[PDB]
Amino acid sequence: GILKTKYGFDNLYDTVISVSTSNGNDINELDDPEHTDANDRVIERLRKENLKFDPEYYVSEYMTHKYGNEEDLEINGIKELLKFTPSIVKQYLQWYKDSTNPNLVMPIEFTDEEQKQMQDNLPKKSYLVEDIKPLYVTILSVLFSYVFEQIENEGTHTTESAWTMGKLCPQISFLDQQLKQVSLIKIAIITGIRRALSYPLHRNYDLAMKAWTFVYYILRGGKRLVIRALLDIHETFRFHDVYYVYDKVLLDDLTAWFISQGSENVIRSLALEMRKEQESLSKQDIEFECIWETLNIREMEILAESEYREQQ
């Protein structure tokens, strides 16, 4: 509250987020984006996630998925979403199936449009960044936000796409690259799940886990495939007349830095590490404070199933 703390890529930016909230930036979730230190952003985010989470919404989604009739499933959409494969994932999995050496990174020839985007829309500066770990974690988190949007919209962007991506990415909504109060990869995965169960239209653990599995595939595809995703994200924010501030303060530099300095070996290790962390998780790791008691989401489901069986 008293002093300024910078934010965004390499904590270089200020002013612009505060200005944007007077001009319709509803992605920002910090009460005081210019005067909240990194640890306080985590504390505020965790508090706000517990408040945002709606257990009744969550268990209604769960009950529809598991017990809904054909029409309720169709109206809700969950079954169709869980069958959808975004183009970027599909192109990787096709190449992986057909390759004589599937261990390698996926060859990617950038389209004319992607080339023009890189030439016309990204900063032309050199980068010297001391602390790259938070950047790779940002890539992990923002890929999840992107994949989730791609699934929920069945591959067609809408005017709400930037909001969905911004809300599922703590580095955007809360300018929070720290994530942990005080592994970081595990915390990033859990954070993505908690936010996917609290903010979007479809709030479903299987859907969130599907998105993380697809992030794993994108990372396994390698640097150029990750660039393809980052360019799509950048374009989504760039031509939204409120939300472009997130390109200014984070995604412009994240994308340009990654193109110039991103490591294939780091990306492959990140793919394998995040998959190991993801596979270690269960619903018992996903907890919320509810009206106060701490409950995991499986406990919530069981309690709801019991009430439904009694009503039947």
Side-chain angles (χ1 to χ4, degrees):
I2 301 177
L3 303 177
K4 294 175 291 180
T5 300
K6 292 188 179 65
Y7 48 66
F9 182 89
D10 208 26
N11 309 112
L12 301 171
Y13 289 89
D14 59 55
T15 310
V16 293
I17 296 295
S18 177
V19 170
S20 76
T21 62
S22 288
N23 293 298
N25 174 3
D26 55 347
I27 287 177
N28 172 248
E29 223 171 314
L30 286 169
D31 291 334
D32 192 351
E34 303 294 329
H35 316 266
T36 309
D37 76 16
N39 199 59
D40 285 335
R41 292 177 200 154
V42 177
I43 297 167
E44 183 176 337
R45 179 174 56 73
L46 293 171
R47 177 180 56 187
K48 285 184 178 185
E49 286 171 353
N50 288 315
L51 292 172
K52 182 69 176 68
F53 179 75
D54 180 342
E56 306 286 35
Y57 193 125
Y58 174 77
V59 306
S60 295
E61 292 278 272
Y62 167 86
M63 293 300 289
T64 293
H65 184 200
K66 184 159 196 306
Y67 305 105
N69 65 37
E70 190 202 331
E71 193 181 359
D72 286 330
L73 284 169
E74 187 165 49
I75 291 163
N76 182 278
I78 181 66
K79 287 256 182 193
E80 184 167 359
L81 264 29
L82 288 173
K83 295 190 291 176
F84 181 81
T85 314
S87 188
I88 193 180
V89 174
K90 210 188 279 192
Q91 75 186 233
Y92 172 68
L93 292 176
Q94 188 73 54
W95 172 88
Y96 180 81
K97 172 187 150 286
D98 295 339
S99 178
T100 57
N101 194 348
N103 166 87
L104 267 17
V105 299
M106 186 185 176
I108 294 291
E109 290 302 308
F110 292 115
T111 65
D112 292 335
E113 196 177 52
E114 288 168 330
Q115 288 282 12
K116 284 173 169 59
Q117 284 157 207
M118 289 187 278
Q119 293 163 188
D120 296 337
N121 301 349
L122 297 182
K124 285 118 150 51
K125 66 173 89 180
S126 297
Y127 293 91
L128 296 166
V129 175
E130 313 297 305
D131 191 14
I132 60 172
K133 177 81 176 155
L135 297 176
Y136 282 103
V137 174
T138 301
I139 287 166
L140 181 73
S141 294
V142 80
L143 288 177
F144 170 81
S145 309
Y146 172 68
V147 168
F148 186 97
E149 180 272 344
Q150 284 287 284
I151 295 162
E152 193 175 46
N153 287 154
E154 293 176 281
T156 308
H157 293 314
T158 71
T159 58
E160 309 200 81
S161 286
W163 188 94
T164 303
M165 298 186 199
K167 283 306 192 183
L168 300 184
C169 178
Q171 296 83 350
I172 291 168
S173 52
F174 282 90
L175 305 172
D176 172 15
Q177 286 173 202
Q178 186 182 304
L179 304 187
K180 185 174 194 179
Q181 196 177 153
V182 136
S183 76
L184 184 57
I185 289 166
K186 191 166 190 169
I187 294 162
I189 298 169
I190 291 169
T191 301
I193 296 165
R194 297 179 83 245
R195 299 186 69 73
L197 299 184
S198 304
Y199 293 89
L201 178 58
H202 303 83
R203 306 182 191 169
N204 180 293
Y205 175 87
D206 292 337
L207 178 59
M209 282 301 209
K210 173 189 182 71
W212 279 117
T213 295
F214 286 177
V215 173
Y216 164 64
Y217 294 146
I218 293 172
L219 292 169
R220 213 176 65 189
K223 180 168 168 180
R224 287 168 80 90
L225 190 67
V226 173
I227 292 168
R228 171 157 285 160
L230 293 177
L231 290 174
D232 195 6
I233 300 162
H234 188 275
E235 189 85 331
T236 300
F237 279 86
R238 182 74 270 209
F239 293 95
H240 195 291
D241 86 317
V242 175
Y243 303 144
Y244 72 95
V245 62
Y246 294 107
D247 277 354
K248 189 179 189 187
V249 305
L250 181 64
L251 306 167
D252 279 353
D253 294 313
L254 185 71
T255 307
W257 162 84
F258 185 67
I259 288 166
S260 60
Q261 303 290 337
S263 161
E264 293 276 26
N265 284 346
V266 173
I267 288 294
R268 178 54 64 90
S269 179
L270 181 59
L272 302 182
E273 288 280 6
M274 66 83 86
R275 183 60 161 179
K276 178 185 194 298
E277 296 302 335
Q278 186 200 181
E279 290 177 334
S280 83
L281 289 172
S282 77
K283 290 183 172 175
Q284 302 180 38
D285 293 296
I286 313 298
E287 293 183 326
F288 290 95
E289 297 225 3
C290 302
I291 299 173
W292 254 276
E293 54 174 355
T294 306
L295 290 168
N296 72 59
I297 63 178
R298 182 67 186 138
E299 293 176 290
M300 302 173 201
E301 296 164 3
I302 286 169
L303 298 162
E305 277 169 318
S306 306
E307 294 173 330
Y308 167 82
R309 289 179 190 192
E310 289 190 323
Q311 283 149 24
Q312 278 216 87

